[PDB]
Each structure stands twice: as structure tokens, then as C-alpha cells.
RNA sequence: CUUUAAUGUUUGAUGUUCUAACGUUGACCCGUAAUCCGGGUUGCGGACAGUGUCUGGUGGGUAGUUUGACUGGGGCGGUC
RNA sequence: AAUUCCUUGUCGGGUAAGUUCCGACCUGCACGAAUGGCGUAAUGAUGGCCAGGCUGUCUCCACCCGAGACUCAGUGAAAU
RNA sequence: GCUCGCCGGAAGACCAAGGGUUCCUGUCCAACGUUAAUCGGGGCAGGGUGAGUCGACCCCUAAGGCGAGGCCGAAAGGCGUAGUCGAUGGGAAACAGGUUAAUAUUCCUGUACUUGGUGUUACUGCGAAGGGGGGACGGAGAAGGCUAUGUUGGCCGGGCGACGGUUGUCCCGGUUUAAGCGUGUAGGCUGGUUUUCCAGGCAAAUCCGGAAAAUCAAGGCUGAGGCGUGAUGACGAGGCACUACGGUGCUGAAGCAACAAAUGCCCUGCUUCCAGGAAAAGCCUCUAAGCAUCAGGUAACAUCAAAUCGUACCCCAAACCGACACAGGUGGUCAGGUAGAGAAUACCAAGGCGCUUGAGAGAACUCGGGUGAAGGAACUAGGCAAAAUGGUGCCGUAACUUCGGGAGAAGGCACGCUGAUAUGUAGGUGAGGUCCCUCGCGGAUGGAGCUGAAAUCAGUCGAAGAUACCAGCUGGCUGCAACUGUUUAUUAAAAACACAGCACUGUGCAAACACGAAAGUGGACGUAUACGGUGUGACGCCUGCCCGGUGCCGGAAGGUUAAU
RNA sequence: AGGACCGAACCGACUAAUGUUGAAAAAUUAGCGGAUGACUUGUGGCUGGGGGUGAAAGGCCAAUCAAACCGGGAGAUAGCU
RNA sequence: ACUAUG
RNA sequence: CGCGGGGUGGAGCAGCUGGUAGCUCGUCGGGCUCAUAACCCGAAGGUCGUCGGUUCAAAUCCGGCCCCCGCAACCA
């Protein structure tokens, strides 16, 4: 069976890199709260 | 002429196309394309506002003049063309300055053609005149509304509005709805009915040919459940509504015009 | 008092004109290398249209809810 | 009758025998004209019925070829 | 190592994606590996990825994104102009041979090409953010020319056979060579050249567009392949020798012709059809502002430059997506022989595998196959399943029909091998030689050689000649839906949805309607022969009565009635 | 010429048997339907939860759908176990 | 305002 | 059966709120016509299904019995 995760690292970084983040106010909000939980990956960068 | 197809599959046996061998064969005339791409019925949000559209063949929009603007200067009809924008064929004309433009093909119309613009121009089909400058009587098309804007009225194939009465600044026009209604008289007309009138008499004879021009299919509110549509559910075939749009307004009957500032123009609302 | 008249009078609302608000998804000119926007010139509409506050009508388009108990199982019937 | 409760209605056809099928009748419980009526060549992994061919489907199973089963060696689960 | 078996339009080779050291060498076997393991995609150490031309980067744009000013919005924000991003598309250039344990169009040997910069010399109207050209575009179909490629002959080098025959019309192997440069062919497109005038291309234009005369008909553009050169080279079956028996060294034969032939190239061609088939830059050309001894442009020669990042390995999979070393999933490219219509199927080549538990036994029962006396649907809810039918050519073919169909209806017949007609025909191809010529990749006749159906007649073997694999069961009545389609991913494929067609109804354009507190966008760069909604559902014959009820439409006199 | 016919690739999913702690959280073997189109497929893009999309099955929206998933109100409430 | 049958 | 409705001159209907039985057709008698039908005139006829209660009094209010319709008889 063709299964739901087909990957694509263009795509990967344009829904979740850092600069989709950076782009709007709640993708900020979200590195805020993942930089204050501690967390070594912010996001799917390398 | 309307060509009865011979019906050698099932989806043959009820086409009837309209063949019109005075058309060009050939590639149209490149310095009035331009690119024109496709909607899907969707806007600016993505959503689709408007439902069945979606599909077809790729189409190259053809700069029409409908303002007819360049006055005085006679032009020839070097030949008529197909436009796939349009029910109307479209003519390709030479001005005596070598311009070229497309411009709607009026009934009886043919190669080698004079077409003039503007006031001094002689009252034969094809021809632009302000409204001043036609007779009372006369079948006119691609009307204007404010002048200077373009035609907008009677540009379909095979319709005209009809001139009716003259009563100062104003004229009156018997629209091809049925449908009186005063235009202010600098406002230009091109002379004639519109062309390829046979138009209406084609039959497209299966589903994929609606699907050709671009047409996805329809789904009835009976169909649907209800949360989709009024027309919802029952075991079985019900209805015992009031037929309505999906949107729940009364289709059959109710009246949707509310437009106050244009009233005063309207001599009288259609048949 | 009844009926009625012109003297004057305060508001009315029913037309018809007008232009100066307002409209213009008419045309041209400029910012400008720009089918946005703005400004100008000129036409066409014109106190209408349209937007606010108040208000009647409509409104399963949407929402929140209700839709009893007894009962030799429940329902129907019957009762309170 | 994709509609008929009574109903395996009655009559005819087909079978040695037909609650199904086909043709009729009309007593339509409760068909019916674009929530379409009656017809229809072609089309259908569509529903029902009949016939020829073919057969281990069956009378009624028999034998054979391979893979597991069983024994030996090594590895080694699970529901409860 | 020697046999055996399996794949071979893949179970082979090569890209993209995705992974990221899994690649190669040494070493180790605790754990991992559904068993052991000295082996490993496992542990440890070391090694390996070499570019002006391949790809990204870069120049250009699509759908789309972001968006200075701007418009709109309690706030957050939304939409969008100028712009700026965004490939899956457009834009310069490389081939053959060699070599490592592991890279190679990247290294080495040869032979090439591309675009920039600076300098010299000769000649000279250069120049946009503007104008024009070009780039620049669909489907189907046909058939002519080729090549890749293959088969046969000839040429060269080996062999003369473990068992009867095998010095011959016998056997085995080889017969390969590129980009580039030169020539310009089958074919395809097109009248050509010079002058004059002109409300067009936002201004100017010598460019494009337009109108006019005058003059020769053959000039131009495009173009596969072939031949020439590249190549006195490279490769090359083997042979002559040294060897840690892994390989290292030295030399090297022939290297032609004929036929068949693509789904590849001419071909972005040609013929045809309606549903009428991107954009922008590079590129070519025109001028405006500007500058004229300059600057810049054109050609020739020199000289310098072409950075950076990717490059190992897996890729129909043990390395990707499926928790697994998982019978699943995954875009593109290549296409040998014999049979065959074929990319089907069988057997094979190149190449690659034997699927990481085995060894015995030969019970019941289960799984997957084979055969079956007599009968032949009696089975069963139901012929479910199985059996059967199956090819090519020829004969022949009913009701009904929308005249197309039904129809491959049904149902028959022939089919192997050998020979003759003809030591191989009809046909296809076409050399030598003569003849001609605006003398070449030319034309005429000419037919050597090569290839080669189909038929008839005569013979001959078998139980059976479409012998295997491959490959329709057929007919009759009837319901429903006209038809091809679509549907419940994971128990429903249907009579459900859709459909062409029909009808009603709304909508006069700043349209109705829809998405949006709004700006705005779709509808539509459409305009009533158009667009939205609702119902019915090809076609044929038709479509009756009711306006009391409920909706909708119109009507305004009177009644009732809100804020004020 | 054709939403024409037969039939590989490719798309699908009608019947049966197997499998049902599977080889597989939907497959395998043998047959089956489409196969120049209302076809199929790659890369990128748009539509967002009472919202989307839907040739309409309440189908699909990351093995979840008559209202997704993650976090919060939140120790919701539970005359019931 | 009249009308049908034998 | 559970619920509800209806039995009225010969036929179809109205009257059912206790004191009063009507409408159209049919029957009977008279006319008109040669005769019949139509047409004109005049007259009758109803135990209000049946039994029993209630009231001074019952077609009428109330109960039982009989016939006749309609609706319901469901979830497993």
C-alpha cells in the first residue's frame, strides 16, 4: 500500500522550516514556546 | 451549415456541429493574444464562488476592439477567424493606415468587406455611429451604455437590439430580452444582427463534449443529504419542500433585482 | 353657533426643474516606467443612490434548548 | 408489477412434478403522466427464468504429485 | 572449483527522489542476523567522492507567494500597485580510448569546442527602462527517407574431436572505432530584387505594418543521413614470456559487402479535425535622450579567466515509504537471439540470482495441483467452483434495428514435413557495364548478387499438424438503467450519482449569485443564441383535471399596524 | 472518424479460494472491467474545521470524521458503576 | 323561445 | 379486541344545544297527448337500528345488544 508519509525535503521546508515560522506572528509564538521548553530542535532545518 | 453526424459509436448518434467553411484555417494573429488562465470558479480566498466551472482546453484570449474608436478611416475584412472566448466568430481588419484589429463579425460579412467608424460613415452593416446619427427603426449591436466605455449590449451570436425611439439626449432600445430601456444617444452602435446565428441549433451529443468548454457536472439537491442542501433526504425519492438554492432563498418565482439607481433607465421590465 | 371667504400665518408632502454635497466599476492629463491608489480637467447621474442610529416585517440561513410520570419490559391506550 | 395484503389469485405455456419464469385477465388492499407515463435497437463484472455444450458440482468417492502435519537437531512466541 | 536449477520488457543495466557512509581494505564475532557463522548492509581502525563543457548555483519567466507607497479593517491583521521571489518549463560549450581495491564525459593519453575580460592592429554611427521580429508552443493520422540494431555472406585467426560419420556447401572466435571539422544530400518551406509615398506601431525610426509602380524568374532559408577527415592513431582473437598462480610484461591478424529494420532521427515537418492549443529572457533588428578626434561598435590576432557547492553507495530496493533484512508501494531511461501480430507467451544471450533454518519420514487432516469406470447438474439458495470454448484464412449467418448495428451471431471447412511448377516463383532490393549530362551525394537503360510471401498439384509420418506456452463457451425469453463514465480508501459498483437532451425560473451588467465585518475577488477580461438556481434525464409516442390548502407573482381602494 | 472494437504496459477492483496472533492494520494466486480519454501519471501550487472538497457514499480532509489533530478552560459534570 | 318516441 | 364515527318516509340526505321532522328524487290521484315520456296541479307516507334507563317529556342526554364503516394492532 502506498502509505500517508512520501517525503520531500522542498516541501518539508516550506510547511515547517524556520523561515515559514519567522513569517507569520503565531509561527513565532510557536519557536517562543519551544525555545522556552528547552528544546534542541526548533525545527526540521538539516 | 448543421451536419447531422452519423451515429458509427453511441456518443455520435446525437451530435450535430456547426461547420462553417468561411473560417480561417491557420494560426490566429499573434500581436493581439495574450495568456488567459484558468479559474476554476475560485477567487481570491481560493473558495469556489461559483460552482461547475473547472476543466477544458487551453484558450488564448483574443483582444477584441468593442469601442471602435479610430474614426473616419476606412478599414477591409481581411477574414473571419474562430474565437473559443465567445459564441460570436471574430474578423480581422486592415485599416488604411495598416493597423490591424479583431472586431465582432456582423450577419453577412464576408472577405473584401469596407467597414467605417464614426459620423460621416454611410448606415450599412458592419459600420459604428453614434446613436444621434441611425435611423429610428434600425437593428443595431454591441451597443455602449456611457459613452466612450465599449459595447456592452447585443454581443452574443445571432442578437441585436432594436432602436425604437428618439426623445432628446436619450433613445429608446427594445433589448433581445424583451426588456425597453433608455441609453443616452452619443453612445455608439455597429450596424446588423451579430453573426453565426446557426449557433444555437448545435447539439454537443455526450458529456465529455460539456466537458470540452470547460463544464463540470451538476449534482441535484434531492440527491444530497441535509446537511449539503434543503432537498436532503427521505427513504426513498422525496421532496415537499419549496424549491430553493442551495443557499436556502426560493428559486422558481422570487424576484432578485434590488438595484435603485439604475430604475430610472428602464421603460419596462421583460416579458 | 352652523357654513364659508380672502386677508396673514406656522408647519406639511405630492409633483416638476436646478447644482453645490454625494456617486461614477465614462473619457482624457499628471504623480509614473503603474489596468492599484491619489490629484486635476471634462462628461453623466444627483439630493436619488449609499453608509450610521432607531424601527416594523421576514428569517431552520445559523445557534441555544425543550419534547412529563405511572406502566406485570417499553410503545399505543388509559390515568394524574 | 422493483408497486397486489388476501395470494402458491384465475387461465394458458414450459417440467414426470414449476410458491420462481413467460403470456394473459383486472377483483389497481395502496399504478399513472417531467418527484414524468408507455415503448425502445445498442450497451451492462446489473436482477429473474430456460436450453445446448461441458464437466468430481453430485450418485460416491478412488489413486497420484508437491507444500505443511509427524520425528530429529538449532532458535523460540501468543491469547488466557 | 565442477556440475544442477531460476530471472532475462527482469529477479539485468542507468538516472531522479529519498536516505547519508550503507562504498573499498584490514580486523573481531559479545549483541544484531528468526539456525550456525570463520560470513555480513553488525563491532573497531584505516581509506575513498578530483569538472570552463554533467548537475545545481546563475539569466528568464508560469501557477502561485511576499509586497514600498496604497485601499480596507476594534487590535491582531486582510487585499493588492510598483516591484521582488517562485520550475515541474526557456537560456553557451566534449568525445573516444586508458587506468584504482574503492572516482571518472571530473584523473591520464589523444583530439575538440564555449563564453567572458584586458591588450594590439585594421575598419567604423554607436546608443534604451522604449518600437518591431524571434523565441513560441494542440490532438489525431499517414508514409517516404534514414540510422541504432540484427542476420547472412566474404575476410582473418584457431580446430579436425572421449561414441558410428566429420579436409568440407564442416566446427569455434573475431571483423570495433567517437565528438569535432569539411562537403550539403533525400526531403520540407518560400516568389525575388530596387526605388517612391504613407492618419498605424504612445516620440523617432533607415526596423515592422500599409499603398504604389518598375524589373528577372531562380534566389534564399531549413535539413536527417551518407561520403571525406579525426585515425601513420586507438582498440583488437590470440601468441611470446615472467609469476607470491592474484596478475605483470612485450607484440598483434582481418577490420569488408549484402539484406532486413524500429516505438529512435528528418519531423517544432506534412495531411487533417475542433475542443482552437504558456510567459519572459538569451538572440536578431530599429531608432529617442545622449556622445562624435572621444566613447562605443565590427573583424583579426594575442593573452588571461571560467569561481563555488554536488560527485562514494543503494534506487521497482535488506540502504527509499510501510515499527521488521516485511510476498505491499515508488517517477524517468536502455530494449540482444529463436519462434510470434506483439513491449503478450515459451526457451535463451549480456548480466544477475538459488529468496539466511536444515535433516528424515512418506499417517489422519488442511493447502496447491493432476487423472478418473458408468452417469451428466440428480449438487446447490444459485452450475458457486471446476470443466469446456479459444488461432489464421475461406465459406456462411436469424429475429429485431435508431439502418450504424445485431455479428466473431449461429455453424462449417483447410492447416505438419518433403518435392515439383520455380536446382527460390510473385514481389522487394539493387552491383558491374554501356548511354547521357546545367560533370555530381546526378539521370537513363541494365539486370549480377541478396532477400522472399502466397497458392496449386504430387508425395510422406503420426492416435492427434492452431500439436507446447498463448488463446471467445454459445443460444432463447423477461425486469431496471439509453449509452462510455462516477461511487461508500478498509464487508455495498448497483436499479444509486453523472450524462447529452427537455422544461421552469432568476439575471440589462457596478447582473443575478457566491467568498469576504470591509477593501476587494470570482461570475467574465463574459453581456440574454449569455450567466446562475431547481427538477427531469438519449431517442420515439405523449404529458389529462384541480389555484380550495402552502409558496411565489401582480394589484392598490379600504381596514389593521412600528419607531417618530 | 470514434467518451468505436479485441488486447499488453498503465489505471482499476466483479467472483472464488487462501490468509483472518497474517508474508500484509485490507494482501496473495486464478480468473475479471477500462485501456485516444468525462483517460492516466510526475513536480510545484491553492482551498482549513460548522470550515474545505465532494459525477453525492455523510464520502474524503496524514492507518482518526453526523464535525480532524495539538494545547488550554479542566480536577468540566456523572441522582450511575 | 320551442324540442323525444311509437 | 384498542380508539373514533354512522344507522331517519321506498332511495340519497339534513334535523342530534332535550318540548317543533325537513330537502331533492320516487310512489298515488288528477290534467295535457291519438298514446307514452317530459311538463302543469293536488295528496299521502318516517316504530328515527334494537332493548333498557334518565326526565313531567327522548330522534335528541346515558347504558347494553346488533349490524356498518374508518384508524391502530409496534421494538425486538
Not at chain 2, 468561411?22 to 493581439?32: C, D, Q
Not at chain 2, 477544458?56 to 479610430?70: L, S
Not at chain 2, 466537458?211 to 421532496?239: K, L, S
Not at chain 2, 430553493?244 to 435603485?260: A, D, E, F, H, L
Request: aromatic share 4%; with cysteine; charged share 30%.
Amino acid at each position: 500500500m502506498k502509505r500517508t508519509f512520501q517525503p520531500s525535503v522542498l516541501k518539508r521546508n516550506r510547511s515547517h522550516g524556520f523561515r515559514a515560522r519567522m513569517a507569520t506572528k503565531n509561527g513565532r509564538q510557536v519557536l517562543a514556546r519551544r525555545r522556552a521548553k528547552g528544546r534542541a530542535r526548533l525545527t526540521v532545518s538539516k | 451549415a448543421v451536419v447531422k453526424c452519423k451515429p458509427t459509436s453511441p456518443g455520435r448518434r446525437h451530435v450535430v456541429k456547426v461547420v462553417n467553411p468561411e473560417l480561417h484555417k491557420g494560426k490566429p494573429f499573434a500581436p493581439l493574444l495574450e495568456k488567459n488562465s484558468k479559474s476554476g470558479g475560485r477567487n481570491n480566498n481560493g473558495r469556489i464562488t461559483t460552482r461547475h466551472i473547472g476543466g477544458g482546453h487551453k484558450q488564448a484570449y483574443r483582444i477584441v476592439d468593442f469601442k471602435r474608436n479610430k474614426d473616419g478611416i476606412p478599414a477591409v475584412v481581411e477574414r473571419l477567424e474562430y474565437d473559443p472566448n465567445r459564441s460570436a466568430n471574430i474578423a480581422l481588419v486592415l485599416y488604411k493606415d495598416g493597423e490591424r484589429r479583431y472586431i465582432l463579425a456582423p450577419k453577412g460579412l464576408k472577405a473584401g468587406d469596407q467597414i467605417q467608424s464614426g459620423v460621416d460613415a454611410a448606415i450599412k452593416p458592419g459600420n459604428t455611429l453614434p446613436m444621434r446619427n441611425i435611423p429610428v427603426g434600425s437593428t443595431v449591436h454591441n451597443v455602449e451604455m456611457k459613452p466612450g466605455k465599449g459595447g456592452q449590449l447585443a454581443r452574443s451570436a445571432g442578437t441585436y437590439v432594436q432602436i425604437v425611439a428618439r426623445d432628446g439626449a436619450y433613445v429608446t432600445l427594445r433589448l433581445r430580452s424583451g426588456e425597453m430601456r433608455k441609453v443616452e444617444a452619443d453612445c455608439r452602435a455597429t450596424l446588423g444582427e451579430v453573426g453565426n446565428a446557426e449557433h444555437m441549433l448545435r447539439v454537443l451529443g455526450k458529456a465529455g463534449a460539456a466537458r470540452w468548454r470547460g463544464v463540470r457536472p451538476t449534482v441535484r439537491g434531492t440527491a444530497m443529504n441535509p446537511v449539503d442542501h434543503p432537498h436532503g433526504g427521505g427513504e426513498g425519492r422525496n421532496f415537499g419542500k419549496h424549491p430553493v438554492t442551495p443557499w436556502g432563498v426560493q428559486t422558481k418565482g422570487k424576484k432578485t433585482r434590488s438595484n435603485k439607481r439604475t430604475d430610472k433607465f428602464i421603460v419596462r421590465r421583460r416579458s
